[PDB]
Amino acid sequence: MEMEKEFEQIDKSGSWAAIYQDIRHEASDFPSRVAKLPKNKNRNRYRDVSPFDHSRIKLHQEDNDYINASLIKMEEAQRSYILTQGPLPNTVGHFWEMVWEQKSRGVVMLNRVMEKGSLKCAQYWPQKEEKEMIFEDTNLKLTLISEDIKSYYTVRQLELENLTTQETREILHFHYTTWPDFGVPESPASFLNFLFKVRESGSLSPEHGPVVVHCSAGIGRSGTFCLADTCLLLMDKRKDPSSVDIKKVLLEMRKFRMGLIQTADQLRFSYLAVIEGAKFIMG
Numbered sequence: 001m002e003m004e005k006e007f008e009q010i011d012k013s014g015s016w017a018a019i020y021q022d023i024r025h026e027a028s029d030f031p032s033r034v035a036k037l038p039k040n041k042n043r044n045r046y047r048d049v050s051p052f053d054h055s056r057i058k059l060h061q062e063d064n065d066y067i068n069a070s071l072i073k074m075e076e077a078q079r080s081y082i083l084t085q086g087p088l089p090n091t092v093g094h095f096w097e098m099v100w101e102q103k104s105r106g107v108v109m110l111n112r113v114m115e116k117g118s119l120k121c122a123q124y125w126p127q128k129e130e131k132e133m134i135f136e137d138t139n140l141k142l143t144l145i146s147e148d149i150k151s152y153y154t155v156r157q158l159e160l161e162n163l164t165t166q167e168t169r170e171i172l173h174f175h176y177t178t179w180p181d182f183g184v185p186e187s188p189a190s191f192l193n194f195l196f197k198v199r200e201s202g203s204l205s206p207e208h209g210p211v212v213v214h215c216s217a218g219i220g221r222s223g224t225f226c227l228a229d230t231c232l233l234l235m236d237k238r239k240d241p242s243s244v245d246i247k248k249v250l251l252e253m254r255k256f257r258m259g260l261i262q263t264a265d266q267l268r269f270s271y272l273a274v275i276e277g278a279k280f281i282m283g
């Protein structure tokens with residue numbers, strides 16, 4: 001079926017939970033043996049969210065190459081993304097090592113450091129220009145260059161220096177600051193505006209490594225971001241945009257990381273975002 005009318009048909013019939021459970025039943029199951037080794041317990045935020053072995057990002061280290069991060073490679077859309085958990089106190093150095101080694105331009109953050117009164121990820125970037133951060137375990141230095149605070153999101157320019165070689169690179173930090181503590185946003189308008197700002201920066205484009213996107217577990221809000229982006233790109237590429245099937249795209253992405261889209265409300269919000277976004281692209 002088309003999307004917008006499949007949408008109203010699920011709303012009128014109140015069957016979002018049944019649609020979402022079908023997706024969960026059909027989703028791929030691949031091994032995640034490296035994630036479960038005992039030496040990696042303090043590298044995982046949640047015991048039930050792990051990268052598959054076949055698609056995990058490897059650190060360029062011979063001691064321990066593990067990070068909770070996955071490469072999502074979308075062949076027809078010609079886009080790639082790295083989805084990862086919010087960094088932990090003992091993985092902030094690994095996080096920036098990955099950004100460096102994978103040649104990423106942008107980092108997309110969809111959570112606040114504290115939500116619901118608890119810490120959802122480490123304070124992994126500097127908050128003042130004159131107070132830079134040094135990660136001694138991976139030999140990197142990170143400096144805040146500039147910060148632009150808007151009503152729904154903040155954009156930061158950061159400098160990452162590889163202290164071994166003295167090479168430097170500019171990284172863009174795109175921080176969506178207004179996702180509600182419970183549920184999903186009422187309108188997708190500010191989320192779409194944010195997505196378009198990431199696109200306009202070059203961070204999603206083939207001349208760079210894959211964008212790094214995270215929330216707390218790296219599957220829920222993060223899944224919504226890449227699912228909406230890929231679906232809108234396919235609608236631009238194909239002769240028949242109404243052939244784009246959001247459930248099929250989601251199942252394809254779940255071949256690369258488990259659990260993408262965590263609730264039926266997140267699934268409904270993803271439909272809403274693609275539907276509204278497709279009108280703005282044209283008119």
Ligand SMILES: O=S(=O)(NCc1cccs1)c1ccccc1
Pocket residue numbers: 003004235236240241242243244274275276278279281282
């Ligand atoms: O016809 S669509 O599948 N896509 C239209 C587009 C053409 C080019 C980019 S987007 C559609 C329309 C409205 C709501 C959902 C889906």
